[PDB]
Protein backbone atom coordinates (compact mmCIF):
# COMPACT_ATOMS: atom_id res chain seq x y z
CA UNK A 1 0.00 0.00 0.00
CA UNK A 2 2.85 2.09 0.80
CA UNK A 3 4.56 4.65 -1.64
CA UNK A 4 2.37 5.44 -4.93
CA UNK A 5 3.91 8.00 -7.21
CA UNK A 6 2.58 8.84 -10.84
CA UNK A 7 4.70 6.10 -12.80
CA UNK A 8 6.73 5.56 -14.51
CA UNK A 9 6.68 8.93 -16.32
CA UNK A 10 5.20 12.36 -16.64
CA UNK A 11 5.72 15.12 -20.08
CA UNK A 12 5.62 18.53 -20.03
CA UNK A 13 6.77 21.34 -22.45
CA UNK A 14 9.34 24.03 -20.61
CA UNK A 15 7.53 26.91 -20.49
CA UNK A 16 4.86 24.55 -18.19
CA UNK A 17 3.36 23.97 -14.86
CA UNK A 18 3.68 19.90 -13.43
CA UNK A 19 1.96 18.71 -10.37
CA UNK A 20 3.55 15.23 -9.30
CA UNK A 21 0.83 13.35 -7.54
CA UNK A 22 2.24 11.43 -4.67
CA UNK A 23 -0.32 9.22 -2.20
CA UNK A 24 1.20 6.89 1.17
CA UNK A 25 0.01 4.58 3.74
CA UNK A 26 2.36 4.67 6.64
CA UNK A 27 1.97 3.30 10.23
CA UNK A 28 3.58 6.21 11.90
CA UNK A 29 4.47 9.46 9.48
CA UNK A 30 7.29 11.15 10.78
CA UNK A 31 6.97 13.53 7.61
CA UNK A 32 7.15 13.47 3.71
CA UNK A 33 9.94 14.59 1.13
CA UNK A 34 11.12 15.32 -2.45
CA UNK A 35 13.89 14.42 -3.40
CA UNK A 36 15.45 15.15 -7.52
CA UNK A 37 17.50 12.59 -9.26
CA UNK A 38 18.83 13.47 -12.32
CA UNK A 39 19.80 9.92 -14.42
CA UNK A 40 22.00 8.74 -13.17
CA UNK A 41 23.52 10.28 -10.64
CA UNK A 42 22.41 10.39 -6.74
CA UNK A 43 19.16 11.89 -5.43
CA UNK A 44 19.38 15.85 -3.65
CA UNK A 45 17.13 16.96 -1.05
CA UNK A 46 14.12 19.39 -2.68
CA UNK A 47 11.01 19.40 0.44
CA UNK A 48 10.33 18.29 3.87
CA UNK A 49 5.98 18.57 4.94
CA UNK A 50 5.24 17.24 8.42
CA UNK A 51 2.29 19.94 8.50
CA UNK A 52 -0.66 20.81 6.33
CA UNK A 53 -0.36 22.20 3.26
CA UNK A 54 0.85 24.32 0.78
CA UNK A 55 5.13 26.09 0.82
CA UNK A 56 6.76 27.66 -1.81
CA UNK A 57 10.68 27.49 -1.26
CA UNK A 58 11.33 29.13 -4.52
CA UNK A 59 10.26 27.58 -8.04
CA UNK A 60 8.74 24.83 -6.16
CA UNK A 61 6.04 24.35 -4.20
CA UNK A 62 4.86 20.94 -2.16
CA UNK A 63 1.64 19.99 -0.65
CA UNK A 64 0.81 18.24 2.41
CA UNK A 65 -2.69 16.46 3.45
CA UNK A 66 -2.24 14.26 6.40
CA UNK A 67 -6.19 14.22 6.25
CA UNK A 68 -5.79 12.18 2.74
CA UNK A 69 -1.95 10.73 2.91
CA UNK A 70 -1.97 13.19 -0.44
CA UNK A 71 1.50 15.01 -1.59
CA UNK A 72 2.09 16.76 -4.86
CA UNK A 73 5.31 18.61 -5.82
CA UNK A 74 4.40 22.00 -7.98
CA UNK A 75 7.79 22.78 -10.49
CA UNK A 76 6.39 26.00 -12.21
CA UNK A 77 8.21 27.98 -15.35
CA UNK A 78 9.03 24.64 -16.10
CA UNK A 79 12.73 24.45 -17.93
CA UNK A 80 14.90 21.62 -19.07
CA UNK A 81 17.03 21.17 -16.37
CA UNK A 82 14.17 19.59 -14.32
CA UNK A 83 13.95 16.65 -16.69
CA UNK A 84 14.96 14.09 -14.11
CA UNK A 85 12.83 11.93 -11.74
CA UNK A 86 11.22 13.04 -8.53
CA UNK A 87 10.96 10.86 -5.87
CA UNK A 88 8.36 10.72 -3.06
CA UNK A 89 9.78 9.56 0.26
CA UNK A 90 7.89 8.87 3.78
CA UNK A 91 9.97 9.12 7.16
CA UNK A 92 8.65 6.29 9.38
CA UNK A 93 9.47 4.03 12.81
CA UNK A 94 10.96 7.28 14.95
CA UNK A 95 13.22 8.95 12.66
CA UNK A 96 15.53 5.46 11.69
CA UNK A 97 14.58 5.26 8.14
CA UNK A 98 13.06 7.31 4.86
CA UNK A 99 11.02 5.07 2.69
CA UNK A 100 10.90 5.69 -1.33
CA UNK A 101 7.84 5.89 -3.51
CA UNK A 102 8.86 3.94 -7.15
CA UNK A 103 9.74 7.57 -8.85
CA UNK A 104 7.80 9.90 -11.41
CA UNK A 105 10.44 10.16 -14.76
CA UNK A 106 9.52 13.92 -15.97
CA UNK A 107 10.74 14.65 -19.22
CA UNK A 108 10.85 18.20 -20.03
CA UNK A 109 9.96 18.80 -23.81
CA UNK A 110 11.86 21.64 -25.67
CA UNK A 111 9.43 24.43 -26.98
CA UNK A 112 10.74 25.06 -30.65
CA UNK A 113 10.48 28.87 -32.18
CA UNK A 114 11.16 28.03 -35.80
CA UNK A 115 10.61 23.98 -36.54
CA UNK A 116 11.75 22.67 -40.28
CA UNK A 117 11.50 18.75 -39.45
CA UNK A 118 13.66 16.69 -41.77
CA UNK A 119 15.21 13.48 -41.95
CA UNK A 120 19.05 13.66 -42.96
CA UNK A 121 21.71 10.83 -43.76
CA UNK A 122 24.79 10.73 -42.24
CA UNK A 123 27.58 9.09 -43.85
CA UNK A 124 29.91 7.60 -41.15
CA UNK A 125 33.37 8.82 -40.39
CA UNK A 126 36.09 5.91 -40.93
CA UNK A 127 34.50 3.28 -43.70
CA UNK A 128 31.53 1.67 -45.00
CA UNK A 129 28.43 3.69 -44.00
CA UNK A 130 26.78 1.87 -42.02
CA UNK A 131 23.98 4.46 -42.72
CA UNK A 132 22.28 6.63 -39.78
CA UNK A 133 19.42 8.97 -40.22
CA UNK A 134 18.54 12.03 -38.15
CA UNK A 135 15.29 13.03 -37.49
CA UNK A 136 15.59 17.05 -36.40
CA UNK A 137 14.09 20.19 -35.76
CA UNK A 138 10.60 18.97 -35.43
CA UNK A 139 8.09 20.52 -32.82
CA UNK A 140 7.37 19.19 -29.16
CA UNK A 141 3.69 17.77 -30.60
CA UNK A 142 5.90 15.02 -32.86
CA UNK A 143 6.45 11.71 -30.99
CA UNK A 144 8.63 9.53 -32.32
CA UNK A 145 7.40 5.62 -31.89
CA UNK A 146 9.99 2.75 -32.30
CA UNK A 147 10.30 0.62 -35.39
CA UNK A 148 8.18 -2.29 -36.85
CA UNK A 149 11.58 -3.65 -37.66
CA UNK A 150 13.67 -5.49 -35.12
CA UNK A 151 16.97 -4.88 -37.41
CA UNK A 152 16.41 -0.96 -36.62
CA UNK A 153 17.38 0.93 -33.63
CA UNK A 154 15.56 4.41 -32.86
CA UNK A 155 16.89 6.78 -30.17
CA UNK A 156 13.63 8.82 -28.48
CA UNK A 157 13.56 12.20 -28.71
CA UNK A 158 16.62 14.29 -27.37
CA UNK A 159 17.30 18.38 -27.14
CA UNK A 160 20.52 19.68 -28.32
CA UNK A 161 21.02 23.12 -26.18
CA UNK A 162 23.19 24.74 -28.42
CA UNK A 163 23.99 27.86 -25.39
CA UNK A 164 26.20 30.26 -28.11
CA UNK A 165 22.98 31.07 -30.88
CA UNK A 166 19.80 30.65 -27.88
CA UNK A 167 18.85 27.58 -29.43
CA UNK A 168 17.89 24.19 -28.27
CA UNK A 169 16.57 21.44 -31.04
CA UNK A 170 14.72 17.87 -30.90
CA UNK A 171 16.05 14.67 -32.49
CA UNK A 172 15.49 11.15 -32.81
CA UNK A 173 18.33 8.63 -34.27
CA UNK A 174 18.03 5.31 -36.79
CA UNK A 175 20.31 3.09 -37.78
CA UNK A 176 20.28 -0.30 -39.29
CA UNK A 177 22.32 -3.30 -40.56
CA UNK A 178 23.51 -3.25 -44.47
CA UNK A 179 20.38 -4.61 -45.29
CA UNK A 180 19.72 -2.18 -47.36
CA UNK A 181 17.31 0.25 -44.73
CA UNK A 182 16.36 3.83 -45.77
CA UNK A 183 16.01 7.22 -44.43
CA UNK A 184 12.88 7.65 -46.56
CA UNK A 185 11.49 4.29 -44.66
CA UNK A 186 13.35 4.61 -41.58
CA UNK A 187 10.74 6.35 -39.12
CA UNK A 188 7.41 4.54 -41.01
CA UNK A 189 6.29 3.67 -37.12
CA UNK A 190 5.71 7.36 -36.48
CA UNK A 191 3.04 9.76 -36.62
CA UNK A 192 5.43 12.61 -38.45
CA UNK A 193 4.59 15.83 -40.28
CA UNK A 194 3.62 16.68 -43.75
CA UNK A 195 6.17 19.10 -44.17
CA UNK A 196 9.16 16.70 -43.21
CA UNK A 197 11.98 17.74 -45.56
CA UNK A 198 13.35 14.32 -47.43
CA UNK A 199 16.98 15.03 -48.76
CA UNK A 200 19.02 12.06 -50.59
CA UNK A 201 21.33 13.10 -53.57
CA UNK B 1 30.32 14.42 2.26
CA UNK B 2 29.65 10.88 1.69
CA UNK B 3 32.06 9.08 -0.13
CA UNK B 4 31.61 5.44 -1.96
CA UNK B 5 33.55 3.09 -3.42
CA UNK B 6 33.57 1.45 -6.40
CA UNK B 7 31.95 3.24 -8.84
CA UNK B 8 31.68 0.24 -11.06
CA UNK B 9 32.14 -3.24 -10.43
CA UNK B 10 31.33 -6.39 -12.42
CA UNK B 11 31.47 -9.95 -10.51
CA UNK B 12 31.24 -13.34 -11.52
CA UNK B 13 28.44 -15.62 -10.40
CA UNK B 14 29.29 -17.23 -6.50
CA UNK B 15 31.91 -14.40 -6.18
CA UNK B 16 32.23 -11.88 -3.18
CA UNK B 17 32.90 -8.34 -2.76
CA UNK B 18 32.21 -5.24 -0.46
CA UNK B 19 30.71 -1.72 -0.63
CA UNK B 20 33.06 0.95 0.84
CA UNK B 21 31.14 3.99 2.30
CA UNK B 22 32.94 6.81 4.21
CA UNK B 23 31.18 9.99 5.74
CA UNK B 24 33.05 12.68 6.59
CA UNK B 25 30.42 14.69 7.86
CA UNK B 26 30.19 12.92 11.16
CA UNK B 27 26.89 11.90 10.84
CA UNK B 28 25.29 8.82 13.29
CA UNK B 29 22.20 7.41 10.85
CA UNK B 30 23.95 5.32 7.18
CA UNK B 31 22.21 3.29 5.14
CA UNK B 32 22.40 1.39 2.02
CA UNK B 33 20.27 0.88 -0.77
CA UNK B 34 19.50 -0.61 -4.11
CA UNK B 35 17.88 0.79 -7.26
CA UNK B 36 16.76 -1.26 -10.24
CA UNK B 37 14.36 -0.05 -13.03
CA UNK B 38 10.49 -0.02 -12.29
CA UNK B 39 12.49 0.38 -8.85
CA UNK B 40 12.58 2.60 -6.69
CA UNK B 41 15.13 2.64 -3.88
CA UNK B 42 14.90 0.19 -1.68
CA UNK B 43 16.98 -0.09 1.52
CA UNK B 44 18.90 -3.48 2.18
CA UNK B 45 20.34 -3.32 5.75
CA UNK B 46 21.29 0.59 7.71
CA UNK B 47 22.93 1.17 11.13
CA UNK B 48 21.64 4.16 13.93
CA UNK B 49 25.13 3.89 15.18
CA UNK B 50 29.15 2.60 15.59
CA UNK B 51 28.21 -0.82 16.03
CA UNK B 52 24.52 -1.57 15.58
CA UNK B 53 23.32 -3.06 11.85
CA UNK B 54 19.16 -3.06 11.20
CA UNK B 55 16.53 -4.09 9.31
CA UNK B 56 15.21 -4.62 5.62
CA UNK B 57 13.47 -4.73 3.38
CA UNK B 58 15.08 -5.87 0.71
CA UNK B 59 18.11 -7.54 3.23
CA UNK B 60 18.53 -11.15 1.70
CA UNK B 61 21.47 -11.68 0.66
CA UNK B 62 23.91 -8.83 1.96
CA UNK B 63 26.04 -8.32 5.08
CA UNK B 64 26.47 -5.35 6.54
CA UNK B 65 29.15 -4.02 8.89
CA UNK B 66 29.34 -0.85 11.18
CA UNK B 67 32.92 -0.42 13.09
CA UNK B 68 33.18 2.79 12.88
CA UNK B 69 31.03 5.64 12.82
CA UNK B 70 32.89 7.17 9.12
CA UNK B 71 32.49 3.94 7.33
CA UNK B 72 29.32 1.66 6.87
CA UNK B 73 30.29 -1.77 4.27
CA UNK B 74 27.84 -3.39 2.06
CA UNK B 75 29.16 -7.07 1.93
CA UNK B 76 27.82 -9.40 -1.41
CA UNK B 77 29.10 -13.05 0.05
CA UNK B 78 27.71 -15.38 -2.91
CA UNK B 79 26.89 -12.69 -6.06
CA UNK B 80 23.81 -13.49 -8.03
CA UNK B 81 22.81 -12.29 -11.44
CA UNK B 82 19.20 -10.61 -9.28
CA UNK B 83 22.32 -8.59 -7.06
CA UNK B 84 22.73 -6.15 -10.80
CA UNK B 85 21.58 -2.87 -10.05
CA UNK B 86 22.63 0.94 -8.87
CA UNK B 87 23.49 1.00 -4.80
CA UNK B 88 23.42 4.39 -2.76
CA UNK B 89 24.51 4.75 0.29
CA UNK B 90 23.24 7.32 2.59
CA UNK B 91 24.65 9.40 5.69
CA UNK B 92 22.26 11.30 8.04
CA UNK B 93 22.30 13.51 11.67
CA UNK B 94 19.03 13.52 13.08
CA UNK B 95 18.87 15.60 15.39
CA UNK B 96 20.81 17.74 12.88
CA UNK B 97 15.38 17.63 9.07
CA UNK B 98 15.61 14.83 8.86
CA UNK B 99 17.26 15.39 5.22
CA UNK B 100 19.67 12.76 3.45
CA UNK B 101 23.14 12.82 2.34
CA UNK B 102 23.24 10.18 -0.81
CA UNK B 103 26.54 8.68 -2.07
CA UNK B 104 27.44 9.15 -5.61
CA UNK B 105 26.52 4.97 -6.70
CA UNK B 106 27.64 1.85 -7.45
CA UNK B 107 26.96 0.07 -10.30
CA UNK B 108 27.22 -3.25 -9.91
CA UNK B 109 26.91 -6.39 -12.77
CA UNK B 110 26.91 -9.87 -11.83
CA UNK B 111 27.57 -12.25 -14.82
CA UNK B 112 27.62 -16.16 -14.80
CA UNK B 113 30.69 -15.76 -17.45
CA UNK B 114 32.80 -13.82 -17.61
CA UNK B 115 33.77 -13.92 -21.44
CA UNK B 116 30.80 -11.98 -22.43
CA UNK B 117 31.82 -8.97 -21.04
CA UNK B 118 32.99 -6.67 -24.16
CA UNK B 119 33.70 -3.27 -25.05
CA UNK B 120 32.20 -0.47 -27.22
CA UNK B 121 32.97 -0.17 -31.47
CA UNK B 122 32.52 3.49 -31.38
CA UNK B 123 31.50 5.30 -34.49
CA UNK B 124 30.99 9.15 -35.40
CA UNK B 125 28.69 9.97 -38.53
CA UNK B 126 29.43 13.26 -40.21
CA UNK B 127 27.08 15.56 -40.42
CA UNK B 128 24.85 15.79 -43.90
CA UNK B 129 25.58 18.41 -46.60
CA UNK B 130 21.89 18.84 -46.88
CA UNK B 131 21.41 19.88 -42.87
CA UNK B 132 24.17 22.27 -43.28
CA UNK B 133 22.07 24.34 -46.30
CA UNK B 134 18.65 23.81 -44.70
CA UNK B 135 19.53 24.68 -41.60
CA UNK B 136 23.47 26.06 -41.52
CA UNK B 137 23.75 24.28 -38.61
CA UNK B 138 25.96 20.64 -38.28
CA UNK B 139 24.82 17.67 -35.92
CA UNK B 140 27.45 15.01 -35.88
CA UNK B 141 25.51 11.55 -34.63
CA UNK B 142 28.08 9.29 -32.40
CA UNK B 143 27.23 5.47 -31.84
CA UNK B 144 28.54 3.03 -29.44
CA UNK B 145 27.63 -0.54 -29.89
CA UNK B 146 28.30 -4.00 -29.03
CA UNK B 147 29.20 -3.70 -25.48
CA UNK B 148 28.61 -5.54 -22.41
CA UNK B 149 27.74 -4.45 -19.97
CA UNK B 150 25.91 -1.00 -19.48
CA UNK B 151 28.95 0.64 -17.56
CA UNK B 152 29.87 3.44 -20.24
CA UNK B 153 30.47 7.43 -19.71
CA UNK B 154 30.43 9.12 -23.19
CA UNK B 155 32.00 12.79 -23.30
CA UNK B 156 32.43 15.11 -26.77
CA UNK B 157 35.94 16.85 -27.64
CA UNK B 158 36.47 19.38 -29.43
CA UNK B 159 40.38 20.42 -30.30
CA UNK B 160 41.18 18.46 -26.95
CA UNK B 161 38.88 20.54 -25.22
CA UNK B 162 35.15 18.64 -23.09
CA UNK B 163 32.15 20.18 -24.86
CA UNK B 164 28.83 20.47 -23.23
CA UNK B 165 27.29 23.17 -25.84
CA UNK B 166 25.24 21.42 -28.12
CA UNK B 167 25.33 17.98 -26.84
CA UNK B 168 22.79 15.46 -26.23
CA UNK B 169 23.14 11.96 -24.98
CA UNK B 170 20.61 9.20 -24.37
CA UNK B 171 20.21 8.41 -21.10
CA UNK B 172 19.77 4.86 -21.34
CA UNK B 173 21.62 2.82 -23.59
CA UNK B 174 19.00 0.46 -25.43
CA UNK B 175 19.46 -3.59 -25.52
CA UNK B 176 20.91 -4.49 -29.51
CA UNK B 177 18.46 -8.14 -28.62
CA UNK B 178 16.23 -7.43 -26.19
CA UNK B 179 14.84 -10.97 -25.06
CA UNK B 180 18.37 -11.98 -24.82
CA UNK B 181 19.26 -11.97 -21.24
CA UNK B 182 23.45 -11.53 -21.93
CA UNK B 183 22.57 -8.82 -24.73
CA UNK B 184 25.09 -6.69 -26.24
CA UNK B 185 24.32 -2.85 -25.85
CA UNK B 186 24.28 0.34 -27.75
CA UNK B 187 24.15 4.10 -27.15
CA UNK B 188 23.71 7.62 -29.20
CA UNK B 189 24.91 11.15 -28.69
CA UNK B 190 24.68 14.15 -31.20
CA UNK B 191 26.88 17.21 -31.24
CA UNK B 192 25.40 20.07 -33.04
CA UNK B 193 27.38 23.21 -34.45
CA UNK B 194 27.29 25.68 -36.72
CA UNK B 195 27.93 24.97 -40.47
CA UNK B 196 31.01 27.46 -40.26
CA UNK B 197 32.85 25.71 -37.64
CA UNK B 198 32.20 21.84 -38.70
CA UNK B 199 33.76 23.55 -42.09
CA UNK B 200 36.48 24.98 -40.82
CA UNK B 201 39.44 21.65 -41.46
CA UNK B 202 41.27 22.68 -38.33
CA UNK B 203 38.47 21.63 -36.04
CA UNK B 204 39.04 18.30 -34.59
CA UNK B 205 35.83 16.57 -33.18
CA UNK B 206 35.62 13.22 -31.25
CA UNK B 207 33.06 11.29 -28.95
CA UNK B 208 34.86 9.71 -25.99
CA UNK B 209 33.23 6.17 -24.85
CA UNK B 210 34.53 5.14 -21.47
CA UNK B 211 33.99 1.58 -20.70
CA UNK B 212 33.96 -0.18 -17.04
CA UNK B 213 34.75 -3.82 -17.59
CA UNK B 214 37.07 -6.13 -15.86
CA UNK B 215 39.17 -4.96 -12.96
CA UNK B 216 43.32 -5.80 -12.33
CA UNK B 217 42.07 -9.07 -10.05
CA UNK B 218 40.31 -10.38 -12.75
CA UNK B 219 42.27 -13.47 -13.77
CA UNK B 220 42.03 -13.73 -17.39
CA UNK B 221 43.70 -16.61 -19.38
CA UNK B 222 41.91 -16.16 -22.98
CA UNK B 223 43.46 -15.37 -26.25
CA UNK B 224 41.17 -12.23 -26.82
CA UNK B 225 42.18 -9.27 -25.15
CA UNK B 226 41.19 -8.88 -21.57
CA UNK B 227 37.97 -6.72 -21.47
CA UNK B 228 39.07 -4.23 -18.97
CA UNK B 229 38.26 -0.47 -17.99
CA UNK B 230 39.38 1.39 -21.35
CA UNK B 231 38.23 4.20 -23.41
CA UNK B 232 37.03 3.79 -27.01
CA UNK B 233 37.56 6.61 -29.06
CA UNK B 234 36.11 7.59 -33.01
CA UNK B 235 36.95 11.19 -34.23
CA UNK B 236 35.89 13.49 -37.54
CA UNK B 237 37.83 16.26 -38.92
CA UNK B 238 36.29 19.36 -40.02
CA UNK B 239 34.99 19.20 -43.93
CA UNK B 240 35.74 22.20 -46.29
CA UNK B 241 33.59 20.79 -49.00
Known amino acids: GQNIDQPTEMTATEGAIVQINCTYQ??????LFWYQQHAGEAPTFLSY????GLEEKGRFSSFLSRSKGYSYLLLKELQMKDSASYLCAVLNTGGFKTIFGAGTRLFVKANIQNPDPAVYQLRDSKSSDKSVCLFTDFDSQTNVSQSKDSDVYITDKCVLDMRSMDFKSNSAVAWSNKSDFACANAFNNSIIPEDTFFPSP | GVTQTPKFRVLKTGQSMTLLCAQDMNHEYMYWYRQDPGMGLRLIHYSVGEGTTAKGEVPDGYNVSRLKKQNFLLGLESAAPSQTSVYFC????????????FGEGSRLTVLEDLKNVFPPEVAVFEPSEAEISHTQKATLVCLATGFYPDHVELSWWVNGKEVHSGVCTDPQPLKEQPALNDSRYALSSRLRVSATFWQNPRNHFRCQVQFYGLSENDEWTQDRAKPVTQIVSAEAWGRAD
Open chain 1, 49 to 52: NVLD
Open chain 2, 90 to 101: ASRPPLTTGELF
Open chain 1, 26 to 31: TSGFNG
